[PDB]
Amino acid sequence: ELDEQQRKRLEAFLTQKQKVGELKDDDFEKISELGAGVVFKVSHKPSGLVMARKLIHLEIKPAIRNQIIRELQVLHECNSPYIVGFYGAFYSDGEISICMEHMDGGSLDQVLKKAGRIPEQILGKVSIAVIKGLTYLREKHKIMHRDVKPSNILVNSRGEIKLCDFGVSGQLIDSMANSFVGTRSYMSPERLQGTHYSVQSDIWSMGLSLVEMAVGRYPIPPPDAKELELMFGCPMAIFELLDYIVNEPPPKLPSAVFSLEFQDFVNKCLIKNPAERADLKQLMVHAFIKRSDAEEVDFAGWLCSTIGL
Amino acid sequence: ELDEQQRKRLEAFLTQKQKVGELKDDDFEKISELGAGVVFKVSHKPSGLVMARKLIHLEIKPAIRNQIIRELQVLHECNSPYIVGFYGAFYSDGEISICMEHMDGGSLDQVLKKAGRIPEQILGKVSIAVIKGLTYLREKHKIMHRDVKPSNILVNSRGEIKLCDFGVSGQLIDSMANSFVGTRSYMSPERLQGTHYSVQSDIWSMGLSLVEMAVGRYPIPPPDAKELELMFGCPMAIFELLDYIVNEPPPKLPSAVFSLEFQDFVNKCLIKNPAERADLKQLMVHAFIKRSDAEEVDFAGWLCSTIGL
Amino acid sequence: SQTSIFLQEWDIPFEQLEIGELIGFGQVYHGRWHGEVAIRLIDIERDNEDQLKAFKREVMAYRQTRHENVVLFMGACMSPPHLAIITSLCKGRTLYSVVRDAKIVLDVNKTRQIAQEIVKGMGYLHAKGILHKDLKSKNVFYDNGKVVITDFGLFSISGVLQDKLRIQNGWLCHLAPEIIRQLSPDDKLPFSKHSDVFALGTIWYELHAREWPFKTQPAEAIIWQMGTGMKPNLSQIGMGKEISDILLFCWAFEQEERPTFTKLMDMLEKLP
Amino acid sequence: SQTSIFLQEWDIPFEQLEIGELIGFGQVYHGRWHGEVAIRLIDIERDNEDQLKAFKREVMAYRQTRHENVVLFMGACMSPPHLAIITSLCKGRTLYSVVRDAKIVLDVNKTRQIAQEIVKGMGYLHAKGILHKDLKSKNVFYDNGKVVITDFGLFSISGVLQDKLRIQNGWLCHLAPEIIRQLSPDDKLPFSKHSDVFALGTIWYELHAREWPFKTQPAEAIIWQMGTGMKPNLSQIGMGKEISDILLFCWAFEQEERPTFTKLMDMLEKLP
């Protein structure tokens, strides 16, 4: 798996990555902010390169940070055309900071909120990006994503589709005490039950996402009989949401609108039984993927026609 | 009522009483002690006269002592052959001191405890001393004794029988907080019931005393049938004692032993009804008194034959 | 073993304790530790090693006894010969000295309210199962007016008993008829819960009549009269109904006839 | 009117209060007043004038709450914007940090004794009618070992809730199934007395298993599993009978099936 032009863009990152020996807290002159849940679009002064710095409050002792940043260097070999190339990691006052490759288009959760609903033709290109992203991580690093969200898929104006923020540093995860839950969950039914999860658990999260990307609304619970009729064109508790994922039928794509290839694709992912659920190999040779693999879509053209630049 | 030789002994006290202008706390060099319930046989240095100083702890403010010693000067006109002539009164640190005429024989309560039982002939002379003592106090000073005890009748080796410690300074009485009760009470039944008491209430105390002086034992409760048989020759509560004085028959003198005159005398005093009880006038003309008035007894001779000197 | 207690055994942090001027039988000192605090110094009786349960269990049980009508018992420590009781300082005067200080209002509302404060404090002691025994008007402080109760439960070490036997003035008429019948060698007296509700009764008399009964009568007179249940008058004007009726209840000859403090509270809340 | 409370409203004499170093959500200061004393500084939420009954009645009710297994609530004063809670300093470490500090004995006797100390403190709160709500192992101190309980009853101002809604780690598994079913906009949750006896159950699990359940599972996994009443294993060796059986009682899906602290005490005293 290698592309001619993509081999250029990757090694063009390896050059500007050696421009920085060590990261300083004052080298990053604050410019703007992406979001919170807290990322910054700072500007490195020695290298002269704008990147995405991410930091969140953490009260830890020096004995912990020595093993946090230790397991945080694994991301170096995880450079991929479908994975955001990170730079480094350090410590600042009372919060750990991580700078990654800047994506001037933002995450898909922001794009979905702007464009309303994303066309099927585009979702096909994004679908392939996720598959190779998980395969490259599991085969060459023995690491899964553990958390796939529309806000975890970064997209730039260069046409690249990469992943970000995945479980790799298990030491850092324990430090993140009192974390937010959310009104919208992408958890797989087997993880909610406490059972062991494979890389196919991220497939559920991928499928559940794609449905939301297509209709412009979180799939659970399924729309009414009048809501879906006025959505075509161009107040629950948390436990009730999670329980609906387990004991109630999976979400489904609207008929007629989307092609049968795309309808079947998300249905193979949203199987409540992980055993009969499709894997990274089966998805790679699916009718929807093989058709969308040969598609020709101006991904950067449609993107900049919605968010600008 | 006046006696030739007694007129000498009284005016001999008026001479040595003017020897002291004011009483000083350091003028009284401590010598010995009489008792407690606290009297001292100190020695006045300027006048050069030994007297009986009496002091008891009292925590009072200067605003009170100004009216305590004020009503304590009434004792000056109360000079009598049957009343201990006092000198003065002052204040020392935190206790009021009173010096009275020294009686080198002590109170009768001490004498009774030494001689065992006091002869009838002697009790006759003592009986007259009490009558005139109460009469002189009530007729010329409008003041009663309010408390007659065997320990309140002082006797010297000069043959004099005088009284001491009687209610006169009503302001001082309130200052004497938390006072002792006693296993032996000389209270009259009418005072125990809260009713008003006259000078005849002290008569009850006199009669109840005389019985104890004669048998060498507190009259209440009356002796057994074997105790009195082994007392001829030469564990109760306080409330039960007081209640026996009220609802039970009065004490009585043993028959045969004492003359009928003396038996009748104490019985006229120990009448539970103050109305039918004898008064100071009736006692003065009683058969026992008129007979004992003409008696000739070596009072000082019998006294010094028991306690010495 | 536990024949001596320390200040560290108490739940209140004690790193330093200083003593000020003397303001007090027992010597009451005006101590201090980041807040004005009263300190009593009493030398206990010699020997009596059986006073384990009489202190290691008694005065130590004053821990976990917190109330707004009861003085804050800071704590206490005792060497085998010495003893020091630490308690919160009352920022005012005693109810004793204010009921005789002419002239205080103490009308129908006030007097009833002050009586309601006492029974509330005694009610908390009624629940914890601790008898005040020596409940006088001299053991109650008034300022805000904020009524508090002190010198509670601690007998033997305190007064007012001691071959004539000495009895106090006020405490003699604070006793219930079952207890006013003592001998000369005696605590260990029939102190009950109705003993305390009687003591309040004479205090309730003390509030309206501005003082406690038997004002002029000698000690022996009190013992017999109160012993035979000769309860003093109340129609000395002006009381009438509603009032004075409760006096008969708190001064009942039979202790069982006297109401409990919790039951008593309803009799006071009923207004005139 | 009474929208602000002062330190003078408390029964403990306060003439001066100084603040030392910082040792602490809420900023915990190492204050002092003639004895080491902890001081918390929390800025209350703006407005909410209806917080009269939520403070003038709630935190003020911590007066008359004295116990040996409960921290000595010194008092508190609040300006309309600010708030400062004063409490006795615990001369030791937290039960949280000692149950994970290898290696502590905590055998059959010790563990049972420590659990008996918690239920005693919670029992006094069970009588006074005050729910701990946030009963964690981080709110218990050990030293002598003397076990005390802090951060009790005071919700809203404390954690650990806050459009995603943030939930803590330990408190998430301290909740009873009736309460582990929250939405995003919420206190005012079904907190009961059986809510606290559940929290103790996971602490009782924390004592034997050296930590609280659901050690690796993500937040959403806890909410559903504990929501459907999927109580964690206990035969992870070595428990057996006697023990672990009480776990089933304190973790009963129905709150009525869970014993009260007073009833619970008998189940612990029974030995293995």
Ligand SMILES: COc1cc2ncnc(Nc3ccc(Oc4ccccc4)cc3C)c2cc1OC
């Ligand atoms: C300002 O005047 C006083 C304030 C007091 N406040 C609090 N306790 C006192 N005294 C007192 C009263 C009783 C006492 O012993 C106790 C026994 C049982 C329970 C509480 C205290 C210890 C002390 C120190 C006080 C005394 C005062 O002057 C006489």
Ligand SMILES: COc1cc2ncnc(Nc3ccc(Oc4ccccc4)cc3C)c2cc1OC
């Ligand atoms: C030595 O380490 C500590 C000892 C503490 N002792 C007593 N309270 C603390 N903190 C604390 C915990 C709770 C709190 O708020 C309360 C709420 C309700 C009841 C009691 C306290 C106020 C404070 C100050 C403490 C904190 C400590 O370090 C974290």
